[model samples]
Target: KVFERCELARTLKRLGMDGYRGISLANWMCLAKWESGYNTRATNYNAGDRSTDYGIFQINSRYWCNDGKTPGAFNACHLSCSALLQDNIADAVACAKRVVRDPQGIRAWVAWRNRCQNRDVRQYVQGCGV
Candidate 1:
């Protein structure tokens, strides 16, 4: 519904990802399509403990807002990319990119492969349930 690809791309670029190195826009879009359908406000209503999650990524508020460095702010979840110095989307994306940027990290691929149950590689391209 939101189709916030620009915002998502901005978030990724802020994390030092070219958005094509190993994973291209098509890959990203495929992921966004599957996960929440590119809706920032989307949340899995059937999910347990939905009280602390929000945004296109559905990042847990416990990590993204409360324990995060930006805790107690007006809205840490909605902060700009540069303002996401705290453990928000930018930091999370940075950590992900670190693993992805590695050329010889079997563990990274292994985790993704396992998560996808070896059914589809692209399914493991990003974050999962809260």
Candidate 2:
């Protein structure tokens, strides 16, 4: 599912992403925009680590979820990577929240650092009524 910008903003807000761990909804929006373009079934395989990133937030297999193929995967989210690809983003959102609980916060995603960090990210949620 490819979500419209405002729709994703509202969805994330309802899922409690608005101010989770001092990260704003716009930042999450920015992360999703660059990570997977708001597509629920998006997937990216990292040849370097032999791990895959799944779903809208591009949660990685190495640390978050298990795909049964990533070597040394920890499955910190305690769910199958396939769960992240569901059209319903609840599991992905829950994993995303767990990710930010780390010391890095939103910076856990390198895409956020490269694109969203210290930038005018409010545009992501602007007029979204979030």
Q: Specify the highest-TM-score model's number.
A: 2
Q: Model 2 TM-score?
A: 0.98
Error of 1 at 96 (Å): 8.0
* lDDT score at residue 8, model 1, on the 0-100 scale: 61
lDDT (C-alpha) at residue 125 in model 2: 87
lDDT of 1 by residue, 17-120 (tens): 54545665334444444545566555433245433434444434433343233344333334332332332455545433444455643233332334332245
Off by over 4 Å in 1: 4-24, 45-51, 67-130
Candidate 2 worst ten-residue window by lDDT: 121-130
Among residues 3 or more apart in sequence or in different chains, the pairs in candidate 2 whose N, CA or C atoms overlap within 3 Å are none
Question: Which lDDT values do the candidates have, in the order given?
Answer: 0.43, 0.94
What digit string (tens of lDDT, one per residue) describes model 2 on residues 1-130?
9999999999999999999998899999999999999999999999998999999999999999999999977998999999999999999999999999999999999999999999999789889888
lDDT minimum window of 10 residues, candidate 1? 78-87
